[PDB]
Amino acid sequence: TIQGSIVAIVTPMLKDGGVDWKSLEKLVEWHIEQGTNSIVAVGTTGEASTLSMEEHTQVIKEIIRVANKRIPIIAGTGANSTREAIELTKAAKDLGADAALLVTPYYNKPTQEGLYQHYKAIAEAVELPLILYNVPGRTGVDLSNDTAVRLAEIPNIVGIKDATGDVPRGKALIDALNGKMAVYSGDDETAWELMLLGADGNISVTANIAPKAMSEVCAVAIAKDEQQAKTLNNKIANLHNILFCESNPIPVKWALHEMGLIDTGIRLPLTPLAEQYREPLRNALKDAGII
Amino acid sequence: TIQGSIVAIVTPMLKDGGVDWKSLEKLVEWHIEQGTNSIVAVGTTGEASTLSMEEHTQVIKEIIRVANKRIPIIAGTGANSTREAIELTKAAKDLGADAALLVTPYYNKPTQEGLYQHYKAIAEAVELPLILYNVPGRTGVDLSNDTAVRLAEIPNIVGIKDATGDVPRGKALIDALNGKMAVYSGDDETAWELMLLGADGNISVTANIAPKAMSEVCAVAIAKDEQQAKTLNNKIANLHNILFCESNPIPVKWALHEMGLIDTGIRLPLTPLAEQYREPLRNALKDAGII
Numbered sequence: 350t351i352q353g354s355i356v357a358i359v360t361p362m363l364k365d366g367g368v369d370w371k372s373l374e375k376l377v378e379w380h381i382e383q384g385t386n387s388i389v390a391v392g393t394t395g396e397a398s399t400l401s402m403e404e405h406t407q408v409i410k411e412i413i414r415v416a417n418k419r420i421p422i423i424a425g426t427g428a429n430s431t432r433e434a435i436e437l438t439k440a441a442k443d444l445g446a447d448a449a450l451l452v453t454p455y456y457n458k459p460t461q462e463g464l465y466q467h468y469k470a471i472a473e474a475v476e477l478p479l480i481l482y483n484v485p486g487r488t489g490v491d492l493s494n495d496t497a498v499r500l501a502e503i504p505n506i507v508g509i510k511d512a513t514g515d516v517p518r519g520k521a522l523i524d525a526l527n528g529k530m531a532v533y534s535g536d537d538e539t540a541w542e543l544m545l546l547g548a549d550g551n552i553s554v555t556a557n558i559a560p561k562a563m564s565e566v567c568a569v570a571i572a573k574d575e576q577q578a579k580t581l582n583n584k585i586a587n588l589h590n591i592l593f594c595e596s597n598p599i600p601v602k603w604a605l606h607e608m609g610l611i612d613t614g615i616r617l618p619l620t621p622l623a624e625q626y627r628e629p630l631r632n633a634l635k636d637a638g639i640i
Numbered sequence: 641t642i643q644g645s646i647v648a649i650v651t652p653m654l655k656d657g658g659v660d661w662k663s664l665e666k667l668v669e670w671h672i673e674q675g676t677n678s679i680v681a682v683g684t685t686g687e688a689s690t691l692s693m694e695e696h697t698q699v700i701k702e703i704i705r706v707a708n709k710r711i712p713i714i715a716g717t718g719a720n721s722t723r724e725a726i727e728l729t730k731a732a733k734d735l736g737a738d739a740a741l742l743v744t745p746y747y748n749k750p751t752q753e754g755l756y757q758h759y760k761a762i763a764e765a766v767e768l769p770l771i772l773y774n775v776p777g778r779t780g781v782d783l784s785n786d787t788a789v790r791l792a793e794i795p796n797i798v799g800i801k802d803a804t805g806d807v808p809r810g811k812a813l814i815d816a817l818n819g820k821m822a823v824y825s826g827d828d829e830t831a832w833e834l835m836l837l838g839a840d841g842n843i844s845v846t847a848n849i850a851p852k853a854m855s856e857v858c859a860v861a862i863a864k865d866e867q868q869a870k871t872l873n874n875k876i877a878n879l880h881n882i883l884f885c886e887s888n889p890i891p892v893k894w895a896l897h898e899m900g901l902i903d904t905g906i907r908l909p910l911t912p913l914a915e916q917y918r919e920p921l922r923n924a925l926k927d928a929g930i931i
């Protein structure tokens with residue numbers, strides 16, 4: 350049901366890596382003001398991997414507190430252990446999240462059946478809307494379209510974030526589902542295209558720095574206005590490239606820093622954007638009218 | 641310094657998933673009796689991903705206890721957060737592990753410099769010998785030969801497990817290194833060749849079910865006896881293929897069950913070996929003389 354521009358929000362940090370609670374509050378308010386439709390708290394772009402359990406709770410709690418029910422909040426609760434995924438997703442429910450976003454277990458390479466049992470076990474453990482998330486380049490595993498369609502039969506599995514960037518494959522999944530659960534782009538470069546083909550929105554990195562513009566791209570693409578979708582997307586299309594010149598969220602955090610909205614903190618093994626990428630990033634932001 | 645056949649040992653579990661302490665103790669004893677030279681506790685084959693921190697501690701402690709100083713014990717202490725890797729590595733030091741084995745951070749895709757910094761930070765925080773581990777198909781990142789050579793300059797970084805199965809690249813690493821740190825194969829199909837080319841050992845899945853045979857292959861490969869290495873490896877070469885019919889450790893745990901050594905317990909998202917691969921695994925075991 351959640352539709353539109355869903356920012357995968359960064360977790361702003363001080364130089365020493367501590368979470369920057371004031372900057373996070375200001376970002377949430379700005380997204381709401383700028384037309385962002387939903388926020389994913391503590392997902393990939395939010396450095397879920399390097400936050401403690403207590404930090405994951407606090408960030409979700411703070412985002413929900415600041416948003417004050419103006420937009421739905423989706424909590425990142427993915428783990429590569431089924432048991433830990435259940436605990437994080439129960440926590441998210443108890444905090445009042447509207448939905449949970451669960452990447453396929455990474456590193457341990459479950460079979461397709463183990464992927465199916467993993468998400469079925471979580472859906473049966475926790476009464477909360479769950480959104481699957483496939484990003485094979487990170488996880489070493491690819492949740493096939495067939496398995497996703499099977500999981501769409503489980504009642505609180507309500508959608509999937511498709512970060513393949515493979516538009517023909519994503520269109521095939523949307524067609525096979527025939528509305529049984531939602532598809533969201535996880536690939537800013539092609540998201541406008543996948544939404545014109547039926548996706549319910551874009552769980553977006555670029556929306557961190559261009560929330561108004563991405564809100565407008567999602568809205569027109571979801572309305573099936575191909576000319577406007579291309580028109581609006583072209584204004585920010587170079588951002589969808591440059592924000593991946595190193596592994597997300599390294600560039601997008603540096604971008605936000607150039608915008609004066611967060612400090613440079615980012616936790617190892619991630620590192621501040623390498624100096625050789627900074628001028629090209631600065632140039633792209635200036636070209637897009639962002640700074 | 642650690643050389644020879646180093647088993648990446650499974651963590652035996654009861655049908656309910658609980659660790660099977662009694663089977664574990666028997667397996668460690670059997671390894672020592674059969675000739676295995678060292679054990680990695682709670683590595684990828686040991687299901688590190690689905691053990692709690694407490695269970696990770698307890699499995700390390702039990703293996704060290706049973707080994708009773710007869711062979712060195714390496715603890716798997718890799719994490720994709722540098723902070724967490726430090727805590728796990730510290731815990732292994734305090735338990736009396738001889739070394740720790742640390743996979744590159746998976747899922748979050750650090751840059752090469754961030755890999756460098758992750759490992760340097762750990763090495764600087766914990767006075768224990770550290771073995772790097774590169775397995776790009778699981779992690780989404782590939783530690784380059786050039787970064788491994790840089791890391792070999794750091795005190796306490798004593799080796800790397802190279803699971804690429806790219807033999808010319810591993811030879812290039814061994815050559816470029818010039819004894820600065822150890823290289824272990826992490827690919828049973830090609831381990832015999834890498835040891836003939838100067839690797840110090842094989843951190844082995846196959847050793848789990850053929851510990852005597854693999855101890856011999858490593859002995860003759862390390863001794864540079866090409867023809868004996870070929871002949872002995874040839875007797876178990878089909879095992880190195882069949883144990884990966886589904887993601888490790890799914891097949892090796894089933895093989896151990898067919899051997900009567902452990903029960904069928906395995907934690908989601910992993911699953912017991914699919915019913916269809918069982919009869920063919922049983923035939924491979926028969927052919928190799930294991931059952």
Ligand SMILES: [Cl-]
Nearest residue numbers: 357389392393
């Ligand atoms: Cl996300």
Ligand SMILES: [Cl-]
Nearest residue numbers: 648680683684
């Ligand atoms: Cl291992």
